[PDB]
Design a protein around this ligand. Sequence first.
Ligand SMILES: [Ca+2]
Ligand SMILES: [Ca+2]
Lengths: 357, 365
Amino acid sequence: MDLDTDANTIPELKERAHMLCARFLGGAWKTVPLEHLRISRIKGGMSNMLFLCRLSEVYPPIRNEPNKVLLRVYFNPETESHLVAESVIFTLLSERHLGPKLYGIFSGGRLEEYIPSRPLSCHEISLAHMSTKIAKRVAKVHQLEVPIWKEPDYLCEALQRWLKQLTGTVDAEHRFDLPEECGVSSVNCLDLARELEFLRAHISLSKSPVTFCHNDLQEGNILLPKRLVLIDFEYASYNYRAFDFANHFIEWTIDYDIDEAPFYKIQTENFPENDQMLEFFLNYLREQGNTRENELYKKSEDLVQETLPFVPVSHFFWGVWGLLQVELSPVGFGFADYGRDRLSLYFKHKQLLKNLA
Amino acid sequence: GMKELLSTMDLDTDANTIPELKERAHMLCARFLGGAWKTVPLEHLRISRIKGGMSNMLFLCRLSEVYPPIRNEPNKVLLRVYFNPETESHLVAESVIFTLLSERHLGPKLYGIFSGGRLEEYIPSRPLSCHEISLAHMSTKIAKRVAKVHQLEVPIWKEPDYLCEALQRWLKQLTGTVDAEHRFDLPEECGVSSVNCLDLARELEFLRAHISLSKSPVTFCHNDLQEGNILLPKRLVLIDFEYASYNYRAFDFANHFIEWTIDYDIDEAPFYKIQTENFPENDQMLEFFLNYLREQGNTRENELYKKSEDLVQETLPFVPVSHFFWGVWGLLQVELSPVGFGFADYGRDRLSLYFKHKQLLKNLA
Ligand SMILES: [Ca+2]
Ligand SMILES: [Ca+2]
């Protein structure tokens, strides 16, 4: 397939979708003829391929089943803990009406309610009025009590398995070249392992309070329904709240609406200014309601320092992720270049993490 | 690991005297509950074995009055350990189911799910006895709770593939655990003197081919409606949806009715007693359905009796289905469970009951 391929014209894809919908939704989805099942590719983040499935007006729902559903397909290797956590999270958000209704979870994907809306652009999340809203939404996510592992082991656990799998997809003599401008011209899997050990040893020294985190607060997951809503908690877990902040601030510099390969553009100069990170925290702390008005500013200042160490953490995380997606994802995205760019940014800001020592 | 440690324990063991058990429990509570559970000295962490069904070992973990909750964490939690081989589809279904029951306050609050078990709110109560579920006033209440479970809309696989999918996996593992020439002897009075895993493989295909012919409406089912999972809180509640899934509603009924005949409160080995004579009479199954159908609210009062009759016929074919299911389950538990139960005898007994009533299933053809 490709960016403009008509999903409906791919029989094998249509059948798999027909099967998934029938099995998880029942009712009209079970007997609807293939020609009366419409499938449309929907635009979304590089982590997944989205397909809007819908029943023609000729075969409307016969009960409480929806007439259209969103099929999300991912390419991240699944683990026991991940399957359990994701199921708990998705069901809880669904049950509390904090996200689209969940319809089903399967190996490598899920079916959920389709919400008419539009995501924010990279530029929009830098706008004061939007950033303010995001801050308040994030404050709420961080207050959620979710029945899953409470220690911030997610980052390292995920990376360790991803690196392990990566190490098994390339020859030992293989090396990934990086733009010298970062300080390191190339790295192999053994180096990545050593860097991961450094990351693990230092983030554990962080005093950033641990909370339930989204972990992928890029613009693509911040929607305006047709009031902002955060969705797709695919990477969600308990984690240092600083990671969610640092990761989000970094997203201000990564634009995904690029039509030319590698299909993304990084403008480090767009990273929020200190004052901008501070305004964000003022809104976040104010929303959580545990900080007196006369203490908000200094608490926000502290939050900024707490966040910086995780800037390189975010870069390493998605850097290794990007490199692994190369051999696993069918998404039309420059994963090879993306992983190398994020990794170079990791080395560029590695000292911010080292400072925790 | 945890399984190896539990196999060294018995019914007369004081959980508090097993340090490794306290350490594992301490880690789990710390990791899923946080707060005081993170720093409570082991001496102030109390653990008591709680009586439960043969599918799991239960331990009530509690913080002494010296180290009370510092936040919103509970002062006590129930640790449940299971010994069923896990699968991707099961890990997901169970997580969705437990989270959904918790969120809707239809069961004990969920605190966490790990490999081979989970942590959930402890409910002061007592379970029903085998004899009690045969009582009219109790049977009526159970019927009403089941009607509600069957009305639940759960975001998991809607087709009734659970029974065969689980059995296929269990049978496969059992096959890999026993000698190729190994045969399980069965009481001759059932019509079959013995079987090996190859035969069971054939039986499963037979079962699969016939149940798919049933017109029994498919609904979310508990699948293990034995007295041990029917509690009276200190109003009956149904808990432990460990085996829950969409399934022919008839399986839930048939399996429950069969439970009237199996008593687990037996002090001598194999630690259970079966009295087929205690199986509900036709009119008793009818009364159960009268209540169940009335509770669902989709049946006119003047059609209850007749619809109930249809439910009895719909249910009978699943009697041998339940027997086969738990029979194979029983045989596999022999090698996986540390629980003090005669699984070998249990598997053989249920299996013989399968062959004894196999015709009821064949009839669907
Ligand atoms: Ca971005
Ligand atoms: Ca029983």
